[PDB]
Amino acid sequence: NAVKTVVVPAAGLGTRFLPATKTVPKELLPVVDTPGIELIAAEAAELGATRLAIITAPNKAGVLAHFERSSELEETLMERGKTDQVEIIRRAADLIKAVPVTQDKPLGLGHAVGLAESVLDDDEDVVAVMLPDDLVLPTGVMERMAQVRAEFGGSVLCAVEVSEADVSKYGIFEIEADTKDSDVKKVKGMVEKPAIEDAPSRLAATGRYLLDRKIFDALRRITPGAGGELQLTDAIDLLIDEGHPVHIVIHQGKRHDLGNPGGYIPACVDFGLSHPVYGAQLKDAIKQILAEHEAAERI
Amino acid sequence: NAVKTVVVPAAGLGTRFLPATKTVPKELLPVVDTPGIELIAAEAAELGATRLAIITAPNKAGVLAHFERSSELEETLMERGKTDQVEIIRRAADLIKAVPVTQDKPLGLGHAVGLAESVLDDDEDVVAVMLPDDLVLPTGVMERMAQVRAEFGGSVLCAVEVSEADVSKYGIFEIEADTKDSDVKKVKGMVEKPAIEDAPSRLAATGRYLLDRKIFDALRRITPGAGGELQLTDAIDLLIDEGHPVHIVIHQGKRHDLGNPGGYIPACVDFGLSHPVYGAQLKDAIKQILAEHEAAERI
Amino acid sequence: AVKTVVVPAAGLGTRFLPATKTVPKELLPVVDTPGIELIAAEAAELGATRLAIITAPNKAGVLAHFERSSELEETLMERDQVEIIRRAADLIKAVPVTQDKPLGLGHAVGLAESVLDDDEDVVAVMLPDDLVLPTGVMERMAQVRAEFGGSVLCAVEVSEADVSKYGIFEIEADTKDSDVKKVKGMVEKPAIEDAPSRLAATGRYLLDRKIFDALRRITPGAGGELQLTDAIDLLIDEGHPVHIVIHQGKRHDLGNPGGYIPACVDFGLSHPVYGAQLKDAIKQILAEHEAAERI
Amino acid sequence: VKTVVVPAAGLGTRFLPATKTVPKELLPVVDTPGIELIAAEAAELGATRLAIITAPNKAGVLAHFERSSELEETLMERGKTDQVEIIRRAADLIKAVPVTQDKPLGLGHAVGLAESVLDDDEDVVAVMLPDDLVLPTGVMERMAQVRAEFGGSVLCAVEVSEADVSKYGIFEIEADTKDSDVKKVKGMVEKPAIEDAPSRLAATGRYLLDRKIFDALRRITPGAGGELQLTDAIDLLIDEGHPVHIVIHQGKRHDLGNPGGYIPACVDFGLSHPVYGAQLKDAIKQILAEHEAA
Ligand SMILES: O=c1ccn([C@@H]2O[C@H](COP(=O)(O)OP(=O)(O)O[C@H]3O[C@H](CO)[C@@H](O)[C@H](O)[C@H]3O)[C@@H](O)[C@H]2O)c(=O)[nH]1
Ligand SMILES: O=c1ccn([C@@H]2O[C@H](COP(=O)(O)OP(=O)(O)O[C@H]3O[C@H](CO)[C@@H](O)[C@H](O)[C@H]3O)[C@@H](O)[C@H]2O)c(=O)[nH]1
Ligand SMILES: O=c1ccn([C@@H]2O[C@H](COP(=O)(O)OP(=O)(O)O[C@H]3O[C@H](CO)[C@@H](O)[C@H](O)[C@H]3O)[C@@H](O)[C@H]2O)c(=O)[nH]1
Ligand SMILES: O=c1ccn([C@@H]2O[C@H](COP(=O)(O)OP(=O)(O)O[C@H]3O[C@H](CO)[C@@H](O)[C@H](O)[C@H]3O)[C@@H](O)[C@H]2O)c(=O)[nH]1
Ligand SMILES: [Mg+2]
Ligand SMILES: [Mg+2]
Ligand SMILES: [Mg+2]
Ligand SMILES: [Mg+2]
Ligand SMILES: [Mg+2]
Ligand SMILES: [Mg+2]
Numbered sequence A, B: 001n002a003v004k005t006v007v008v009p010a011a012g013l014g015t016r017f018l019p020a021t022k023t024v025p026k027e028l029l030p031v032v033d034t035p036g037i038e039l040i041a042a043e044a045a046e047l048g049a050t051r052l053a054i055i056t057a058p059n060k061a062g063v064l065a066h067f068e069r070s071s072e073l074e075e076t077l078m079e080r081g082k083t084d085q086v087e088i089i090r091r092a093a094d095l096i097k098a099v100p101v102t103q104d105k106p107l108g109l110g111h112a113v114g115l116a117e118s119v120l121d122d123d124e125d126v127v128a129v130m131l132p133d134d135l136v137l138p139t140g141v142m143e144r145m146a147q148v149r150a151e152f153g154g155s156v157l158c159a160v161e162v163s164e165a166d167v168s169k170y171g172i173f174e175i176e177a178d179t180k181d182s183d184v185k186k187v188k189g190m191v192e193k194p195a196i197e198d199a200p201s202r203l204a205a206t207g208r209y210l211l212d213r214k215i216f217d218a219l220r221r222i223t224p225g226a227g228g229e230l231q232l233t234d235a236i237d238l239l240i241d242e243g244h245p246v247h248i249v250i251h252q253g254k255r256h257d258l259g260n261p262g263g264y265i266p267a268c269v270d271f272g273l274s275h276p277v278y279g280a281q282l283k284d285a286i287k288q289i290l291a292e293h294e295a296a297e298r299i
Numbered sequence C: 001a002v003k004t005v006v007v008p009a010a011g012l013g014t015r016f017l018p019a020t021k022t023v024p025k026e027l028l029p030v031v032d033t034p035g036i037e038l039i040a041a042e043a044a045e046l047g048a049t050r051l052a053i054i055t056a057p058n059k060a061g062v063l064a065h066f067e068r069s070s071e072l073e074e075t076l077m078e079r080d081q082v083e084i085i086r087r088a089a090d091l092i093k094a095v096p097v098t099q100d101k102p103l104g105l106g107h108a109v110g111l112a113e114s115v116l117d118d119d120e121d122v123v124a125v126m127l128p129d130d131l132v133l134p135t136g137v138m139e140r141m142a143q144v145r146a147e148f149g150g151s152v153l154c155a156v157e158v159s160e161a162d163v164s165k166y167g168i169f170e171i172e173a174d175t176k177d178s179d180v181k182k183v184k185g186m187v188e189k190p191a192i193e194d195a196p197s198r199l200a201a202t203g204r205y206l207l208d209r210k211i212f213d214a215l216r217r218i219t220p221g222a223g224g225e226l227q228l229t230d231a232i233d234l235l236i237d238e239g240h241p242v243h244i245v246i247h248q249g250k251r252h253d254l255g256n257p258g259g260y261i262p263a264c265v266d267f268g269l270s271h272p273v274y275g276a277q278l279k280d281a282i283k284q285i286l287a288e289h290e291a292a293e294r295i
Numbered sequence D: 001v002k003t004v005v006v007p008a009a010g011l012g013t014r015f016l017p018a019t020k021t022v023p024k025e026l027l028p029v030v031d032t033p034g035i036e037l038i039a040a041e042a043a044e045l046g047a048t049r050l051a052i053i054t055a056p057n058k059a060g061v062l063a064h065f066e067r068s069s070e071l072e073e074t075l076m077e078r079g080k081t082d083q084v085e086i087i088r089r090a091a092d093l094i095k096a097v098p099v100t101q102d103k104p105l106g107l108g109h110a111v112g113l114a115e116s117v118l119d120d121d122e123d124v125v126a127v128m129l130p131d132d133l134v135l136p137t138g139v140m141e142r143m144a145q146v147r148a149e150f151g152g153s154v155l156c157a158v159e160v161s162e163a164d165v166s167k168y169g170i171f172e173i174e175a176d177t178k179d180s181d182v183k184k185v186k187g188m189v190e191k192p193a194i195e196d197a198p199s200r201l202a203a204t205g206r207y208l209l210d211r212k213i214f215d216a217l218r219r220i221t222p223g224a225g226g227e228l229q230l231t232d233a234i235d236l237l238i239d240e241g242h243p244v245h246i247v248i249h250q251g252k253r254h255d256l257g258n259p260g261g262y263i264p265a266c267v268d269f270g271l272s273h274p275v276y277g278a279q280l281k282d283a284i285k286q287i288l289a290e291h292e293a294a
């Protein structure tokens, strides 16, 4: 009820998808037919958000364009017989208002988020951040997360339990103490992509955050961490060490990391199987490919 | 036999992937991490082609750019010393030289091929066409098609047997007779996307063509067909009727149609399972997803 | 009559390099307004409802000028200029026709064939780097065509130093109307010696659809380019009637600095905001030059 | 000087509708854009980088300083060897570094964006506005001398007519120096009404600023036109006792930011062109005469 603007950092290089991402933004990759950024925009609308501050890069024009009307394209589609599609290409743009925020160089997720400071209304008390390459299903974890912030103030992040092998890929929470609800916990530290030996838990940060504006000040104090980037994680950890309250909402359901082929492909399968048109066939197709590989393997 | 130019029609709307394709060309979608265009480019270079005539559209600039140096991106990956990443994004340009050919409006695949006429060297004997959303594996069918052409002269296409389910999506051949070779059949007609009841065979046209320069002539005499588009198939069918010799090489191996989600997903799964980095985890993830779907469908 | 007007704008603009490295010469301001926009209202004035703009892959700006600037519009109101920027797009419907390589004016014009409606019987071409003032020659030209049928071009007298920059006519017969002559020849950029006259073609043509067939019969000429002049000449050589309407009024070649600069001065002097100051500024700059030359 | 900051992220409203897609900084002065003249000026002073403040809808600004593989090839085809070098000049002269200004919040704002782009080595913020020509080039060399001998901040002014005060930052003079061309300043006002102008000395777009403007730029409130004015920040620095001196340029100065200054600039350079010179003189004189008679 309080969130007006949601910050969607989409200015990365997407190295894990190269060469494809040389000119295609990972954020626009179709989960069946729909980009994760469009998925994120829809979730933000559901949250009541009225604007989307998209952090973008100079060589990623499509990100913002996806949310603008393309009369060239709509016209073409008219004279071809399909108004049905003109609607599909207007959905994102119509869902919410996209406000582009340029990030010249990909200095970090944290640095990206800091860029949106000037863009929020002075009247906004929280910074809602949604990573466009991360899906938390069913949608609504943000509604749960806001409830927790109302109750405890401070910042709140969404977490998922992860396998020992996936811990190095995420921001990992250091649990401080449990809470009235088993799915809400207070945290004592946050660490970005730790070696498996030095990971405080198996609780990993998904791309959902409801942060206290204090973050911006914490982001100006932080120095570069993992991979030489200015990490949102490190600023959250800063706030933690200062005494600011930071809780996690532990998500029980489906989570899809669209950020690399390993998570993206299964996401396409997942959504592909429930699709009214492709469902049946995909299943058959995939079962045969799985079998083909099993055979290959033994041989 | 001496192919110099290979025509790669990459100017369509990609309706099947909308809304993602609003700004992203389907030809650039990652099969794991590599666009189908880059794979076709590799298949063309393998054939000994030296140049790629990419029919592109005004709104699809990424297609050409994928084949040209990306200064700022290499400079960004350099700072970080992502050396392997720099080579990755140079690969396409190193494979073959891309020549853009604009098709202002998606008048059909036939029309697109027709725009390549002027681009070819006058010394060029055939019109080699490789559709960028269709993988025929392993690469080499084009070499076999050239042998067939050297022998019977005339025009040659590549066919794969397809289920009734896939019939209406492809160009289907009308068989005349079995020839000298088991894999080669002489064709007496071609129909674009027939209904199942109308399909003269189960042999569908793969996007691989070695056409006699006479198609240009033929392409100017056809009228719109399926979709109100100017179909290449319709021109070939025209030549056949005017007694031009047309043969098909029937591909026995794997074939992936990347042109739509139904075929793109499984291609991704198929290449993904063979991937050194993603293989194992994909296998488990997809098994789990299949199993979750089973339970859901019961529950 | 005219429904569509062909505006070739896919050239390289080498005379303005290095500026034209990214800027289309067709977009340079005549004070504040691009020549293409000036051609667009001349087109609209005539009746045309479509503008077939021949463009190049790297001149996205050309068409964009006739498209909406939502991004830019949202920035403007915030602080009477949004009026100004919506102008060109509201004057007429731009239809982009891509010409991948600049093979020639003649080649560029040929690309429009497939774009003109079937019921269309004239090929109206207006070069966007050439101003014929006041607007309306095309109304005149159209009259000459209603009478004589055939193809009509607009000319203006020019001088030896400036003869080699244009398409030059070979006069056949004077005529009734002092300003309408029949032509028996047309040569592109003839050396000073060769010019069959001093009557040069401006960028205004009303051509019979036959120009399309003629364009397929010619070979490269003057600059290794497929010259529209050459196809016109072929049509002449074969008995197709071709007449020129001679413009006695003002004309500006915005296609090169020597022509663009004076065009800016001309419109600038009549400017309600800038006129007075420009006048003073230029008069002093001239004076400084005069002095510099002697001194 | 290592980095010259060049603010080119403006709307260029004065040249609309043309500037809808064309950056005003790219308009040819005959055939050379102001940004290229400014780049040549920066190079002459020894700068190796140009930090260009650019806007999302002005890609050409930066493209102008990059190699056009597609255009160079097309020109090689027609064998135009000179032209290739012509389109390479800018790019060869200096390294362009883009800095994006999403919205045109002001010249001061724009300048602020270049902070994190300067090296620590660098003691000064050299700013050259690409729509203003101070001729002949070299005023910055002079301004440097002045800074060396007074420390602090240095601007370049030109005497201007009453008619033109409102278009510029106008200085309030405080005192003279050993040199008649150098004055210490006591205030700066952006675009004052005629009655309100404290001098007839206008700021040209040349600055050698102490690194303290960054700090000041964060502090000033928007000023004239709703913008964060660089002038207001320089004034703030004045108001807190920081030393600011102006080199008064006695020579030629061409304001290319609006049609009134741009047209005359083109005439002036055109009259000197070995190719267009003579013909322009004649064409212009003739046009003036027609206007007379009209
Ligand atoms: O300089 C940058 C770097 C990234 N991004 C964007 O930020 C998002 C996240 O970047 P990515 O490289 O995918 O981050 P991950 O390595 O996936 O890690 C982040 O996302 C995870 C949840 O998905 C968390 O577990 C990690 O703590 C958090 O750092 C993407 O949309 C990028 O486009 C930028 O805009 N600018
Ligand atoms: O006006 C157009 C239409 C399409 N394309 C391009 O042509 C290729 C083929 O287009 P697509 O719609 O994918 O064709 P399909 O329906 O997949 O059918 C074509 O390819 C099949 C094999 O994949 C054959 O069975 C068919 O006979 C043949 O028409 C694509 O890369 C398009 O981008 C154009 O360049 N211009
Ligand atoms: O391959 C090309 C070449 C040019 N153009 C455009 O066509 C128009 C004319 O090109 P330009 O190089 O300026 O031609 P000129 O050399 O000025 O000569 C043409 O226009 C003159 C009138 O201005 C006539 O005197 C000539 O006969 C005619 O050829 C311009 O807008 C160009 O952008 C194209 O679209 N494609
Ligand atoms: O939000 C902005 C506003 C402007 N600019 C750039 O800054 C330069 C200066 O902008 P301009 O609008 O031309 O300012 P003026 O009205 O010309 O005023 C500036 O330049 C004058 C001299 O040219 C000085 O007298 C003034 O005090 C100074 O404010 C131009 O290149 C703009 O592109 C930006 O980058 N961002
Ligand atoms: Mg990253
Ligand atoms: Mg990620
Ligand atoms: Mg199709
Ligand atoms: Mg296909
Ligand atoms: Mg030319
Ligand atoms: Mg011209």
Ligand SMILES: [Mg+2]
Pocket (backbone or CB within 6 Å): D010
């Ligand atoms: Mg301004």
Ligand SMILES: [Mg+2]
Pocket (backbone or CB within 6 Å): D131, D257
């Ligand atoms: Mg200015």
